[model samples]
Target chain A: QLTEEQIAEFKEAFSLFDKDGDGTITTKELGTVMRSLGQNPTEAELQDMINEVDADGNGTIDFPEFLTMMARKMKDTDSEEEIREAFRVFDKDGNGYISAAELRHVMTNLGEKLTDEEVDEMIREADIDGDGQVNYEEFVQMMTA
Target chain B: GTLFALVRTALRIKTEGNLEQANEELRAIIKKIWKRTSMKLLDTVGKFYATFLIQEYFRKFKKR
Candidate 1:
């Protein structure tokens, strides 16, 4: 038994892999389909998806297996509560959005010393709207991507 | 077309079959793209090339 929100998010994520807009996409599309899913998928869900493919690729998995996989990954992705806590650290002032400077500072210190250009690359990944800032939704997507 | 662009195309075009075999297709595609605007990269770039090898342990894709 999963929450409606959990199921909904999984469905949307499933739909994201449907590169051809079909209800189901082949395992073939799963690899390439994900590069653009969000700038970068922090976790290795795609690899697991590839691994889950049965001899025939289990490409279009049945709902039960899909649910099993999704539920497993849901934990891997962390609860939204954990994600929100991560967002709070980035938001700094409860501004509802994470500015580039804030993100840059955070990553610069967060990593074992990242270059500004590298931090910029990370910033560009989640800042999908090109506004150079990421709100809570965007941050969530990045964390779970 | 850049190396990344060519590889991207290969991944998109031939990913419909066995991943292990499809990678060779990607290899040739990389050659085709690399043969073009060639820059002598003397670094460890192709190391990741070997990383794509996948042995499909059989996951049947039955479309009903």
Candidate 2:
């Protein structure tokens, strides 16, 4: 669920992407926008991303679908419980902390395999207490930040 | 063209007084226009480009 403010923001972004004004965002529009943003996303990649949120199975993203997808991207979770659940997903070992390996595995599962440097950078960023691992507090801080 | 002019007026109203009052006026304008889709488009654009457009419109309005 998005706040009114976030919905407005998402709607604006959606309008920019819905260039044809048909009330739906097609892959062609998305590809063009991505390119303009300096991201040369492939057709297949764009399709894959849209498919994850196109609830109506219509091959195009309607406003509601776009809003839903944007809400997820915004991570507008209303509760700390949801954030804790997300942290637990990455803390697969139930060790109260997320290791670099856990972070890599989670990214890999999402079809985005992080390089060693990227993984190390992320760990360095969130491991604020100088510990090698990210505890729940640090994880929450990073996510909300 | 009429609708465009109406939208311009509505957007001008949106810059008046405090944000709450401006938002109320803008909502009334949207309802009056009865072009829900286009109104929404205008609103979304307003979020990013409204300030610039509003300033320019007033500059022209004042000059003329």
Candidate 3:
């Protein structure tokens, strides 16, 4: 549930993105917003985003579409936040992944005091992608599987 | 594959108390929602302003 303040903030942000004083976010406006955020997206890609979210087929993102997309993205992150929380417990470093070494380190440090062979097998269980380490998708598979 | 169903597995991991030690990860996550390692706002966003937005979001966005 988007509170009034959050919705107001979204409106303000949307107003910034909706340049030209238009009621919608034009593709160019979208491009400008992305550019200010350090993304050098071309209109081709910007148009793709617009096309995907332009629910009214008006070739642009109206406030409703914008609100829907924002809410959807926010909701998606709700779960991912937790999932990544569990991942960080094992990743051990800022290396963007769980290596065989760190996995064992974190595993042994856990309450169960899992042994080396057990942690090694855990890697085998999750690192089937052959990446030699547990990536997010691999980790999720092990989580869900 | 239903992502929510996949998420069902994660639902059981942390809150069960084995991994309640989460601030280490979520702190970084709260730094930037989509800033893991992407290339584009749609980096989709992930820098100073993104961090601010995240901070602002979290200041009051703590509820479900």
Error of 2 at A96 (Å): 0.7
Cα lDDT of candidate 1 equals: 0.51
Candidate 2, residue B24: Cα displacement in angstroms equals 84
- Per residue, candidate 2 scores C-alpha lDDT tens digits across A91-126 of 767889889887776555333445788778778877
Please report the interface RMSD of model 2 to 1 decimal: 16.9
**Global fold similarity of model 1 (TM-score):** 0.33
Instruction: Give Cα-based local distance difference scores for all models.
Output: 0.51, 0.65, 0.61
* TM-score for chain B considered on its own, for each of the candidates: 0.30, 0.27, 0.24
Q: What does candidate 1's lDDT look like per residue over B1-64, in tens digits?
A: 6999989988876775567687888999999889664755522101111111000000010110
At residue A6, candidate 3 shows an lDDT of 66
lDDT minimum window of 10 residues, candidate 3 chain A: A105-114
Error of 2 at B28 (Å): 81
- The residue-by-residue lDDT of candidate 3 on A11-127, one tens digit each, is 655666677877887778877655543347776888887887788898987878877766665565545554555565556565778887876554333223556676566677678
| Fraction of the true interface contacts (Cα pairs closer than 8 Å across chains) found in each model | 0.00, 0.00, 0.00
